[PDB]
Amino acid sequence: GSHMLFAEFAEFCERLEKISSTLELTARIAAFLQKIEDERDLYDVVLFITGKVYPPWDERELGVGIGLLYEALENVSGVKRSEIESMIREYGDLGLVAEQLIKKKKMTTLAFEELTVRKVRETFDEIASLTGEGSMKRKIMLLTGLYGLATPLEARYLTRLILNEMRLGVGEGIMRDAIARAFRADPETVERAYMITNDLGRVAVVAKKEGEEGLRKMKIEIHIPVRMMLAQVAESLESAVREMRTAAVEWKFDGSRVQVHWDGSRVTIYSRRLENVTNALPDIVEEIKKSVKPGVILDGEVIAVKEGKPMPFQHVLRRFRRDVAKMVEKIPLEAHFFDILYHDGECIDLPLRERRKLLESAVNESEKIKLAKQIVTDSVDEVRKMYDEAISAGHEGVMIKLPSSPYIPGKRGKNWLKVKAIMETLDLVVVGGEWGEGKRSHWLSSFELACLDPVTGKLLKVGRVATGFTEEDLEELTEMFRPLIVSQQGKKVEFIPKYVFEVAYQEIQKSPKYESGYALRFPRFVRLRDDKDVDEADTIERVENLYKLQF
Numbered sequence: 096g097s098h099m100l101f102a103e104f105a106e107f108c109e110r111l112e113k114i115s116s117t118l119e120l121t122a123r124i125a126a127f128l129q130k131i132e133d134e135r136d137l138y139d140v141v142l143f144i145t146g147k148v149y150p151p152w153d154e155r156e157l158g159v160g161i162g163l164l165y166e167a168l169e170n171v172s173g174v175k176r177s178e179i180e181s182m183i184r185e186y187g188d189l190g191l192v193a194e195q196l197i198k199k200k201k202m203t204t205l206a207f208e209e210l211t212v213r214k215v216r217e218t219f220d221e222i223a224s225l226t227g228e229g230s231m232k233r234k235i236m237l238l239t240g241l242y243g244l245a246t247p248l249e250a251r252y253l254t255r256l257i258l259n260e261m262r263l264g265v266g267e268g269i270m271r272d273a274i275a276r277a278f279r280a281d282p283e284t285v286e287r288a289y290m291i292t293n294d295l296g297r298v299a300v301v302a303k304k305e306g307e308e309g310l311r312k313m314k315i316e317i318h319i320p321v322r323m324m325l326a327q328v329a330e331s332l333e334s335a336v337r338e339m340r341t342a343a344v345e346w347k348f349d350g351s352r353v354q355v356h357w358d359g360s361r362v363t364i365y366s367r368r369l370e371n372v373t374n375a376l377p378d379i380v381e382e383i384k385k386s387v388k389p390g391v392i393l394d395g396e397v398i399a400v401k402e403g404k405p406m407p408f409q410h411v412l413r414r415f416r417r418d419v420a421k422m423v424e425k426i427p428l429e430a431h432f433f434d435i436l437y438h439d440g441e442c443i444d445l446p447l448r449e450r451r452k453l454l455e456s457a458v459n460e461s462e463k464i465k466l467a468k469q470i471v472t473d474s475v476d477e478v479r480k481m482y483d484e485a486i487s488a489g490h491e492g493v494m495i496k497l498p499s500s501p502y503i504p505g506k507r508g509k510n511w512l513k514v515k516a517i518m519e520t521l522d523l524v525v526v527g528g529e530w531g532e533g534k535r536s537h538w539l540s541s542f543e544l545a546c547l548d549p550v551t552g553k554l555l556k557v558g559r560v561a562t563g564f565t566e567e568d569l570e571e572l573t574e575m576f577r578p579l580i581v582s583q584q585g586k587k588v589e590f591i592p593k594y595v596f597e598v599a600y601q602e603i604q605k606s607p608k609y610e611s612g613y614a615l616r617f618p619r620f621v622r623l624r625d626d627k628d629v630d631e632a633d634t635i636e637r638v639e640n641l642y643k644l645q646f
Contacts, residue, residue: 129277278299497510
């Protein structure tokens with residue numbers, strides 16, 4: 096009929112695997128997108144090609160782990176899970192295994208196959224809604240029903256989609272460019288629209304229906320997260336405060352960045368990576384309802400405090416993880432706001448100094464809700480005094496901002512600069528590992544680390560880490576990595592990209608040993624970052640900038 100079969104999409108994706116050119120990928124994808132008339136097949140295709148079923152800020156998650164996939168594949172193929180697991184290490188991809196099992200199964204028991212993107216979407220939406228007793232088994236039954244109806248190539252990309260790695264060499268950059276190409280829009284205005292909606296599918300549909308003009312007309316709306324404006328690391332305090340002659344200066348807090356939307360009938364709170372953390376923060380939510388003027392979207396920092404003294408940011412992260420009533424008691428919080436993006440209408444096109452005024456009249460300071468102290472100055476001595484004060488208070492340094500700059504969602508330019516005493520850590524994808532030896536043989540001991548190329552979504556190796564781990568760390572990480580082993584050559588294993596580590600280092604060197612062109616000198620494990628998906632790992636561009644900044 097008229098509805099797109101997932102198989103049409105699947106065959107399209109298969110052909111993209113052969114193509115390594117970024118421009119060629121862009122042009123192929125644009126051509127495909129142009130010929131979709133049904134706007135929800137368009138929406139789904141744009142999401143699906145990026146390995147996404149839902150936007151991260153959407154409260155819906157599939158909640159399907161590789162173990163559920165194994166059981167479903169068991170059900171449909173008859174082959175036992177132990178054999179399917181050896182097949183993943185043989186083929187290096189569960190998608191290729193699923194393809195092989197279904198190829199064998201329809202050869203044995205022929206039926207007509209293919210399902211619509213619409214059915215895939217509906218089945219996914221049901222799976223996402225399932226909680227409680229028996230929910231895991233029904234999820235397996237729903238997946239089993241889907242694999243029973245799918246072609247081998249459909250089963251491949253269904254599997255890769257659920258695992259969020261399509262392996263097509265297509266990232267966010269190619270998709271922005273392909274949507275721009277398809278629908279006669281400037282790639283910069285597709286980009287801009289993405290930064291305020293955080294749904295590329297929605298953006299594609301607007302580009303289809305209304306072109307460039309419809310994309311420019313898109314506005315910030317409350318409860319839809321906007322990509323935060325980001326700051327560059329400054330070389331030094333006096334170099335930053337001379338590029339800008341006069342500068343707005345604030346503390347840089349040891350905490351977690353959030354964005355608060357309200358309203359004023361309900362509050363939503365988004366984290367730095369735009370996870371909806373509202374239900375984790377009833378304490379902050381209530382304080383916002385009494386202390387802030389309704390109809391705003393605020394940029395802020397949440398910090399953990401205890402008996403009047405500051406606590407480190409990973410304490411806020413624990414709150415974000417989550418009976419949440421117990422957590423409010425263990426880990427008290429306060430919020431410090433430093434910007435405003437919405438005040439009965441967009442206000443990001445102002446003037447920092449003008450936004451500041453808007454911010455001041457919007458919050459009524461209490462014990463749990465504060466404004467960032469801001470000074471405006473051309474004096475290096477004044478900013479060093481704030482810097483000193485910030486550090487003595489248990490925080491990191493200062494933010495230095497251009498008082499005339501507008502707020503630019505998702506952008507990391509020189510209009511904001513962070514100057515802190517400590518160096519940066521990186522968050523990097525765990526792409527591989529090594530088994531320990533002798534007694535430690537039952538644990539992974541060493542981990543391969545990769546940064547992200549945001550245009551292609553490819554992971555570029557950047558180093559290897561073995562220090563900074565407790566033995567319970569190794570116990571825990573081995574258990575969570577084991578199912579993801581997709582290659583084992585002796586001690587060397589490769590993983591399905593999934594987990595992100597926070598990693599410290601002494602130096603980034605240029606090196607030919609990795610695809611990235613960079614190597615970490617003395618990498619050291621800080622912690623596992625559950626708050627971070629693989630597409631929130633630090634980018635090759637970040638690594639490059641951090642390298643250049645050493646000299």
